[PDB]
Ligand binder design. Structure first.
Ligand SMILES: [Fe+3]
Ligand SMILES: [Fe+3]
Ligand SMILES: [Fe+3]
Ligand SMILES: [Fe+3]
Ligand SMILES: [Fe+3]
Ligand SMILES: [Fe+3]
Ligand SMILES: [Fe+3]
Ligand SMILES: [Fe+3]
Ligand SMILES: [Fe+3]
Ligand SMILES: [Fe+3]
Ligand SMILES: [Fe+3]
Ligand SMILES: [Fe+3]
Ligand SMILES: [Fe+3]
Ligand SMILES: [Fe+3]
Ligand SMILES: [Fe+3]
Ligand SMILES: [Fe+3]
Ligand SMILES: [Fe+3]
Ligand SMILES: [Fe+3]
Ligand SMILES: [Fe+3]
Ligand SMILES: [Fe+3]
Ligand SMILES: [Fe+3]
Ligand SMILES: [Fe+3]
Ligand SMILES: [Fe+3]
Ligand SMILES: [Fe+3]
Ligand SMILES: [Fe+3]
Ligand SMILES: [Fe+3]
Ligand SMILES: [O]
Ligand SMILES: [O]
Ligand SMILES: [O]
Ligand SMILES: [O]
Lengths: 172, 172, 172, 172
């Protein structure tokens, strides 16, 4: 590139990888989104929650792609692996799947910050600090709070709790 | 003071004491406030309730400090004792702790009115009558009502009741 | 915590410590605030300056407590040590006390950034960088400017300078 | 009176006395007001301060007269004693005269509250508590603050301080 400066081939390839990971997470959220709208699941607020996460994740990869172009990197796409399940169980299960996905995304973000820090790339570090890390922290805190409210509503009287949580906590 | 008039050294020192008591109650409410926002407690409305009480208590001590200055008293600060617990249990427990704290504040207010009455200080008596006593009565009535609603929602099906009360009674 | 990730027990405890330090500074500012409103001190603008600092410091600890909850830390409170003086002298003295307090807060902030940097916690580093460090720099620069204006107004004609500075520099 | 109830002849006569005292204070403030507008005194803000006090004191006696009528008392007027001085010196002197007058008014108010308390007349006590006592406290605190600012501006460079205080503190 006529423009590339302080932009290591390692960051470029790790950014390409994080992009595939965002694409895959978006895809997972899409699947959870339509799943909770099945006539036999029918939890509109849960469906909305996950549709919104698919949308947020898309913004993630679009922003990584834009930063790749701005630094003089070359985007390279791989296949997007289908989501890990085709049925997602009940709200607690789905929510725990989502937690696990967000934890993996967060680790991948932290790993890429560590790497850019190690290649003294402060622009890349700042970029992640600004557009990604706090977003992850806030979102994980929110899923944790959700898991705590579902747990409190679970046990013997499981079905009623799931209805109430979707109705009184999730936006529909 | 060039300004002090009918202001006994006893009232002045008791006002200093009530100030430390307000500081301490504010501090207790702060602690209850963040506690109910822990990812493993996650009761936003309860957290809001107690944050608001911390704020109200701060107004209390600021008003006592201002009246101290207006009467020609000298403020004197002591250490603020940390709250009595670091974990606050469930909503009923926290609410009973709050009740007990408010009852102690009310007794301390009544005691200071008695004392100013005994030093024939009608300004101090009126000041408490106007800015403190009815506030205490209204607030204790509210915590009592809350305790009655939690009791009605308690027993075997404890977790569900706590969710509903936070959702349908507390402002979030 | 179901949510904690990359959050060292050292940062958590140092955050708890910084919280007690903010509580203590807020308390010091409260004391300076009412002091300058005594009928025998009577410098409304100075009183306003310090009341505002008490308020800002409270925002500080509330933000640290919120970040503690978001990271999955557990808040732990200690006693709040009373302010170091009960009488604060003249504006120059108070202002130098405030400078010293802000310098200690700044060092404690820098130390905690160093520590999170050493535990490769970029979220914590960014958090301080964003909500604390520049605030400290701006405020210390402002107290320094104030000290320079008081010095210029001091010396033989001390009392007049203190009146003018409160009237023509501080917001009342 | 067809209306009088729980209204002792002692309160009635003490209310008549407090009225003459308010009339006299109003008269004193009138005198201080025009004095500071003499071409050879020429302190507009000081003049305004005292004119305003004359006005406030008039409201005082009008309110006592109205309450006398409402309780079924009979107003009785005596002569109004001329003010104690015809020349009032400099701002510090006038302000100390005003302080002394307000202290005497406050004592007379406290004495009348004590008396109505002793005749178990809660209406009269409340009336004073509501329309008089806090007004006195606030005003004395304000004169004290003023005296502190004048003192700080006094000494060798007396004339300049008096100009600045009238210009930068008093409303003109
Ligand atoms: Fe959307
Ligand atoms: Fe969105
Ligand atoms: Fe967005
Ligand atoms: Fe969007
Ligand atoms: Fe399957
Ligand atoms: Fe950085
Ligand atoms: Fe509030
Ligand atoms: Fe409030
Ligand atoms: Fe309020
Ligand atoms: Fe408020
Ligand atoms: Fe414990
Ligand atoms: Fe009353
Ligand atoms: Fe009253
Ligand atoms: Fe009363
Ligand atoms: Fe403010
Ligand atoms: Fe502020
Ligand atoms: Fe602020
Ligand atoms: Fe603010
Ligand atoms: Fe001392
Ligand atoms: Fe940064
Ligand atoms: Fe930054
Ligand atoms: Fe007027
Ligand atoms: Fe008026
Ligand atoms: Fe008026
Ligand atoms: Fe008026
Ligand atoms: Fe004379
Ligand atoms: O978004
Ligand atoms: O409030
Ligand atoms: O603030
Ligand atoms: O007035």
């Amino acid at each position: 590139s006529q423009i590339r400066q302080n932009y290591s081939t390692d960051v470029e390839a790790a950014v390409n990888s994080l992009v595939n990971l965002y694409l895959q997470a978006s895809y997972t959220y899409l699947s959870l989104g339509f799943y909770f709208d099945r006539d036999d699941v029918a939890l509109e607020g849960v469906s909305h929650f996950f549709r919104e996460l698919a949308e947020e994740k898309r913004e993630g990869y679009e922003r990584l792609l834009k930063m790749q172009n701005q630094r003089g990197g070359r985007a390279l796409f791989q296949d997007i692996k289908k989501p890990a399940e085709d049925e997602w169980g009940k709200t607690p299960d789905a929510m725990k799947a989502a937690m696990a996905l967000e934890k993996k995304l967060n680790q991948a973000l932290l790993d890429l910050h560590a790497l850019g820090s190690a290649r003294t790339d402060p622009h890349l570090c700042d970029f992640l600090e600004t557009h990604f890390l706090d977003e992850e922290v806030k979102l994980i805190k929110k899923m944790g709070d959700h898991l705590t409210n579902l747990h409190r509503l679970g046990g013997p009287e499981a079905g009623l709790g799931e209805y109430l949580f979707e109705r009184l906590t999730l936006k529909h």
